Structure formats: structure tokens, C-alpha cells
């Protein structure tokens, strides 16, 4: 509706008889492959991304925002629990990183 | 062919012109509104050969390849089902096209979801793509994945009793 | 020549892979929109008699 690709913004321009719509908007490019899972198996829990996505780049798996490649580490604070491993398909086995480990661990 | 009919006919002037650009902008008109409506991706999407949706089936969907029009079952049956100077001028976009522009439409919307609408198109599996739009109507991304073998089913089910829907309302 | 739709372009689908990006680009496009028309009046008695 407001330009090709997801929309930020729009400018109006006069023009004789009529008006000209310049779009802002963004465009994503030189994207890259991940292997992707659905849930990661820890603890016999299951872990799903709060808002991205688990990628992996071959050997390490982390979770990103879905429109963006920022590769984080998959922690308690990033992902939700809901039921264990047994039911949900292709779901990999993977750690899950506890921020509040190393402070009851120091 | 009458002569004097068309020597009498040149006293009114210059209606005939009217007329006839009047209908020259309808005609043109109906193959913009065709390119408007059809020709809104200009990369032309295909299946993968293996159909692996997670359990999810578009065959009534996609196009048929046992059928020399290529176009789906469900194309098919609404094509079956639709039935002194005047010429008809044929469509710019002719009907196997107008299917391959669909075909296109629907591969870019199963492999790549809304991806490829806003500019390249990203591949992502189809459940992860379903669990993007549960996510975007509110629900969460474990009730898709526990439940995609229900889901699955009663998309297939609907599906189905559109195409029963079809072929038997007149 | 028969007019072609589009360049092919096979997605790379599997049930395993997603494709992120890495990078964007700011694109401004334009659109262009009629509004009004020019104004014009005709006198009807003006115009058949004068
Ligand atoms: C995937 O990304 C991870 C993290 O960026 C990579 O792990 C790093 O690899 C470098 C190269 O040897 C090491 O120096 C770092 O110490 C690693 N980080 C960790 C936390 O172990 C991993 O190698 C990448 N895999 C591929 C196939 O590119
Ligand atoms: C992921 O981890 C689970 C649990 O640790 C693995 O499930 C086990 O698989 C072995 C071998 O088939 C069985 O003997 C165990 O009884 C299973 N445990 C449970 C709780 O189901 C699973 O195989 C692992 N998957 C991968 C790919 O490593
Ligand atoms: C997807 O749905 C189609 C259509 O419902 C299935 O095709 C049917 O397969 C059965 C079993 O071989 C046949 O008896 C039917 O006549 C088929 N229907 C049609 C319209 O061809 C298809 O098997 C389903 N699954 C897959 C993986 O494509
Ligand atoms: C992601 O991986 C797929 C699979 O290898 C890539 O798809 C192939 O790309 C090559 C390079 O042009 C083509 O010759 C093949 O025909 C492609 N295969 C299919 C099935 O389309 C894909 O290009 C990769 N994506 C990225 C961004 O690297
Ligand atoms: C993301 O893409 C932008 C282009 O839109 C890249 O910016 C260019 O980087 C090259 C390499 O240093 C420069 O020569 C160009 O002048 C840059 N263009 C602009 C407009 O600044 C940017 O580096 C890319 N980033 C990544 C991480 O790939
Ligand atoms: C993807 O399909 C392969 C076989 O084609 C199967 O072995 C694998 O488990 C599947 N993965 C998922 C996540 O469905």
C-alpha cells in the first residue's frame, strides 16, 4: 500500500493536478542460509524463540530477530517453555545458557 | 457499405471518433486491471519436485501436471464451470499465463511466505512459516507446533469441501 | 514474441533450512496520484446558441 517492501515512511510532494508519494521503505538483502529448528530440546523441555528464530551456522545454534541476522545466545530470557520434547516435530537437542547459573555458581 | 449513409453520417461529425476511443480506453483498461491484479511478482516461483510441507497438501492448489493447461483442480473446475462491425479483441494475458502468474503467486507464498512480496524471497519452512502467522494473529508458537498434525488435517479438510463446495453449487 | 512473465526463480525450499538477512537497503520509490481535474464550465445557451 505505501511501496514496494516493508514500510518506514512516506513524504508528500505537490505536483499539478495531483499528488507524489516518495515511500520509504526497507529492503532486505544478502541474505544467508541457516539450518533452522523449530524448538530446542533441553532438560526433557522444550524451548521456543519469545519473538526470532533458531539458526544455526553448522556447528552452533543461536537465535536471531527474524528480519535481521543478529545471532544470539540461546538463554532462559530469549526463549519460553511449553511442554517437553516428545511432541513437537524436529526438535533438536541443544543447551540452553541459565544468565543466573554463574551468580548462585560464584 | 451504403455510401450515402456514410455521406449523411459525415454531417454529425465527429461521434464515430468518440465512440470508438471511448472503447479503445475500456479495452486497454481491462489489461491494465489484469496486470494489476495478477502481474504483481516479477520473479517466477516453483515448487521443489518433493512436496514436504510438514503434512501440509496443496495439490488442489498447484497446478496439475497431467493437465495441458497447467492449471490446478480447483482452476480447473471454475474454467469448466464458467460459461455488423463488433469485434472482440483477445486478452493481452491469455489463461495459461494468467495460471502460471497464480503458480508463481503460490509457490512464492509456500516456500517463502510473505518474504518474497517485500522483496527477495526467503525460503522458510512451511510449519515455521504457519507458527510466523499464528504468532501474528496473537497465538503462540507451541500451540502450531503441538497441534500441526491437526492443523495439517484440517487444512486438507477445508481445502477439500471448497473444492466439494464448488463443484456442487451451481 | 510470446512476451515473458517473469525470470525463473526456484526457491531453495527445505524442510530444515531458513534464509536470513544480513544486510538492507533503504528504498525510496515513487507514486503518483491524480487529484482534481481542471475546472470547466460550460454555458449551455452560450454554447448551442450564442
Ligand atoms: C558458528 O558461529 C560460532 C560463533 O560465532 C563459531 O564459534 C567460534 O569459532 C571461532 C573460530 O574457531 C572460535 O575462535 C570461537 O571461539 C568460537 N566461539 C565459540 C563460542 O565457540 C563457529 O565456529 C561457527 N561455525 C561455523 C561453521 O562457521
Ligand atoms: C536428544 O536427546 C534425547 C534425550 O536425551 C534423546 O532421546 C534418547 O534416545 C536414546 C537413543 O534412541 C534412547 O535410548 C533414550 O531413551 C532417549 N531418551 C528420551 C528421554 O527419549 C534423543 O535421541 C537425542 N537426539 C539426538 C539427535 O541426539
Ligand atoms: C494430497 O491430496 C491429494 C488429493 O486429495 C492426494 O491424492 C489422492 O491420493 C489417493 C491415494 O493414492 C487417491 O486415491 C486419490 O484419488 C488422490 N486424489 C487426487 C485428486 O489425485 C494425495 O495423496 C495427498 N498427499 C500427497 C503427499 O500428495
Ligand atoms: C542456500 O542453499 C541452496 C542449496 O544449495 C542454494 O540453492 C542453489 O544455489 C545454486 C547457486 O546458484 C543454484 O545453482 C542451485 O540451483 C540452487 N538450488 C536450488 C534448489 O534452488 C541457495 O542459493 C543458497 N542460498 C544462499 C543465500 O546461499
Ligand atoms: C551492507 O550493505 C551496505 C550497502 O548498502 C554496505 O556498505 C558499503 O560497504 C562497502 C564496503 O566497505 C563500501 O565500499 C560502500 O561504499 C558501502 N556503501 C555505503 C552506501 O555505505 C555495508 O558495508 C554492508 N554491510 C555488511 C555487514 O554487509
Ligand atoms: C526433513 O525431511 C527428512 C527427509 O526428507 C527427514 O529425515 C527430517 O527428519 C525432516 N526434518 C524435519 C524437521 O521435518
Given at each position: ?106 | ?89 483477445p486478452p493481452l494475458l ?67 469441501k471448497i473444492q466439494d ?6 | ?50
Amino acid at each position: 500500500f505505501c511501496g514496494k517492501g516493508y514500510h518506514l515512511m512516506s513524504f508528500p510532494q505537490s505536483a499539478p493536478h495531483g499528488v507524489v508519494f516518495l515511500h520509504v521503505t526497507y529492503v532486505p538483502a544478502q541474505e544467508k542460509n541457516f539450518t533452522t529448528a523449530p524448538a530446542i530440546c533441553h532438560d526433557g523441555k522444550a524451548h521456543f524463540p519469545r519473538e526470532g528464530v533458531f539458526v544455526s551456522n553448522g556447528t552452533h545454534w543461536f537465535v536471531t530477530q527474524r528480519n535481521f541476522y543478529e545471532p544470539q545466545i540461546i538463554t532462559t530470557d530469549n526463549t519460553f517453555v511449553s511442554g517437553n520434547c516428545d511432541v513437537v516435530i524436529g526438535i533438536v537437542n541443544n543447551t540452553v545458557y541459565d544468565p543466573l547459573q554463574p551468580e548462585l555458581d560464584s | 457499405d451504403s455510401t450515402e449513409c456514410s455521406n449523411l453520417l459525415l454531417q454529425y461529425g465527429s461521434f464515430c471518433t468518440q465512440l470508438n476511443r471511448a472503447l479503445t480506453g475500456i479495452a486497454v483498461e481491462q489489461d491494465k486491471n489484469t496486470q494489476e491484479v495478477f502481474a504483481q511478482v516479477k520473479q517466477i516461483y516453483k515448487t521443489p519436485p518433493i512436496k514436504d510441507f510438514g503434512g501440509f497438501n496443496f495439490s488442489q492448489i498447484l497446478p496439475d501436471p497431467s493437465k495441458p493447461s497447467k492449471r490446478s483442480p480447483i482452476e480447473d473446475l471454475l474454467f469448466n464451470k464458467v460459461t455488423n462491425g463488433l469485434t472482440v479483441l483477445p486478452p493481452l494475458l491469455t489463461d495459461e499465463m494468467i495460471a502460471q502468474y497464480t503458480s508463481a503467486l503460490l509457490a512464492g507464498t509456500i516456500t517463502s511466505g510473505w518474504t518474497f512480496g517485500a522483496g527477495p524471497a526467503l525460503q522458510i519452512p512451511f510449519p515455521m512459516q504457519m507458527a510466523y502467522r499464528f504468532n501474528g494473529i496473537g497465538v503462540t508458537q507451541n500451540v502450531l507446533y503441538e497441534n500441526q498434525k491437526l492443523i495439517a488435517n484440517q487444512f486438507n479438510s477445508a481445502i477439500g469441501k471448497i473444492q466439494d463446495s464448488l463443484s456442487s453449487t451451481p | 514474441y510470446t512476451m515473458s512473465l517473469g525470470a525463473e526463480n526456484s526457491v531453495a525450499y527445505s524442510n530444515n533450512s531458513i534464509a536470513i538477512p544480513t544486510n538492507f537497503t533503504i528504498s525510496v520509490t515513487t507514486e503518483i496520484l491524480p487529484v482534481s481535474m481542471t475546472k470547466t464550465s460550460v454555458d449551455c445557451t452560450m454554447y448551442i446558441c450564442g
